[PDB]
UniProtKB/Swiss-Prot annotation:
Residue numbers carrying Phosphotyrosine: 21, 25, 161, 181
Primary location group: cytoplasm
Coverage span on the entire protein: 233 to 501 of 1130
GO terms for cellular component: actin cytoskeleton; cytoplasm; cytosol; dendrite; glutamatergic synapse; growth cone; mitochondrion; neuronal cell body
Keyword Nucleotide-binding among record annotations: yes
Active-site residues, record numbering mapped to chain: 131
Protein kinase domain location: 10-261
Name of this protein: Tyrosine-protein kinase ABL1
Associated disorder: Leukemia, chronic myeloid: A clonal myeloproliferative disorder of a pluripotent stem cell with a specific cytogenetic abnormality, the Philadelphia chromosome (Ph), involving myeloid, erythroid, megakaryocytic, B-lymphoid, and sometimes T-lymphoid cells, but not marrow fibroblasts. A chromosomal aberration involving ABL1 has been found in patients with chronic myeloid leukemia. Translocation t(9;22)(q34;q11) with BCR. The translocation produces a BCR-ABL found also in acute myeloid leukemia (AML) and acute lymphoblastic leukemia (ALL).
Tissue: Widely expressed.
Length: 269
C-alpha cells in the first residue's frame, strides 16, 4: 500500500537508546532530507503476523500526541518501522536530567495534559496501549510529548483483554486485575497513567521505592498507595488516587482526566 517503503529510501545514522529500546536508529528519509526514527526488527525477535497487525494499527493513528508513522518495510526481514523523530528521546531520562527552573510545575501540567489527550484519543478509537509509562513517552522541542504507539491493540473500549499466562508485566505500572487475572482494558491504562503522573510529579523517581515486587499486589489489595510527592498539588494527587481505585469501573475515563488537566493547565497560565 501507500505506506510501504523501500529499505534504501532510508539511511541510518546513529544507534539510539543504549540498548534499552532494541534495534533503533536516528535515520534520514533521503527524499525529504528529513530526520526520522527507525526501528529495525530482525527475525526471531518478534512474531511476523502480530508485528504486521501492530503496523496496520499505527497506520490508523492520527493524533498530535501519538508518534506519527511515516512508513514501513514489511516484505523481507529485517522489518522497518519509520516514524517522526522526537529530538529529546524518552520522557523518563528527560525528567531526570532536566533544568527544573525550566521544566517547572506548569510544564509538568502541560506534559500530563498532552499525554491524557493521546489516551483520550485511544479511548475514543477502541485501542489499548499496555505499557504506559514515562519510559514510553517521547519528548520534542518545547516540551512537546508523544506516547509511543507501535505496539497498540484493538479492543472495544470498556471490554477486557485476557493475556496468556506466562506473560510478564512491568509490575509497578500494572493494575490489580492485570497482575492477578491477566485482564487488561482501557481502565488498566488509566491505572498505569496514574503511575505515569507520579513519575512526572517526582521528575522520574522509581515507583514504590524499596518495595519488593513480590509484595506489591498484596499491598495494593490492602489499599496501600504511593504517598503524595513533594510539591505535588492536591488536585493532581486526587487524580492519581482516582486512577488507582481498586474497582476498574471506579476509575475516571481519559476524557474526564484530560478535561481536568486542561482546566488546571489553562488556569496555571
Ligand atoms: C519513535 C521515536 C523515537 C524518537 N526519538 C528518540 C530520540 C532518542 N535520543 C534523543 C537524544 N538523546 C540524547 C539520546 C536519545 N532516543 C530514542 S530511543 C527510542 C527509539 C525508538 C523507539 N520506538 C520506536 O521506534 C517504535 C515506533 C517503532 C523508542 C525509543 N528515541 N523519535 N521517534
Amino acid at each position: 500500500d501507500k505506506w510501504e517503503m523501500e529499505r534504501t529510501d532510508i539511511t541510518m545514522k546513529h544507534k539510539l537508546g543504549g540498548g534499552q529500546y532494541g534495534e533503533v536508529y536516528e535515520g534520514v528519509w533521503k527524499k525529504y532530507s528529513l530526520t526520522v526514527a527507525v526501528k529495525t526488527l530482525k527475525e526471531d525477535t518478534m512474531e511476523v503476523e502480530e508485528f504486521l497487525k501492530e503496523a496496520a494499527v499505527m497506520k490508523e493513528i492520527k493524533h498530535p500526541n501519538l508518534v506519527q508513522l511515516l512508513g514501513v518495510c514489511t516484505r523481507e526481514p529485517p522489518f522497518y518501522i519509520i516514524t517522526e523523530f522526537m529530538t529529546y528521546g524518552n520522557l523518563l531520562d528527560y525528567l531526570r536530567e532536566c533544568n527544573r527552573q525550566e521544566v517547572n510545575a506548569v510544564v509538568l501540567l502541560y506534559m500530563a495534559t498532552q499525554i491524557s489527550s493521546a489516551m483520550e484519543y485511544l479511548e475514543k478509537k477502541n485501542f489499548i496501549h499496555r505499557d504506559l509509562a514515562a519510559r514510553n513517552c517521547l519528548v520534542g522541542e518545547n516540551h512537546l510529548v508523544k506516547v509511543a504507539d507501535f505496539g497498540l491493540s484493538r479492543l472495544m473500549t470498556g471490554d477486557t483483554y485476557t493475556a496468556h499466562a506466562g506473560a510478564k508485566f512491568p509490575i509497578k505500572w500494572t493494575a490489580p486485575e492485570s497482575l492477578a487475572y491477566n485482564k487488561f482494558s482501557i481502565k488498566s491504562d488509566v491505572w498505569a497513567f496514574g503511575v505515569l503522573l507520579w513519575e512526572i510529579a517526582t521528575y522520574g523517581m522509581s515507583p514504590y521505592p524499596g518495595i519488593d515486587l513480590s509484595q506489591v499486589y498484596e499491598l495494593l489489595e490492602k489499599d496501600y498507595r504511593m504517598e503524595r510527592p513533594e510539591g505535588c498539588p492536591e488536585k493532581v494527587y486526587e487524580l492519581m488516587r482516582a486512577c488507582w481505585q481498586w474497582n476498574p469501573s471506579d476509575r475516571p475515563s481519559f476524557a474526564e482526566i484530560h478535561q481536568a488537566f486542561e482546566t488546571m493547565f489553562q488556569e496555571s497560565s
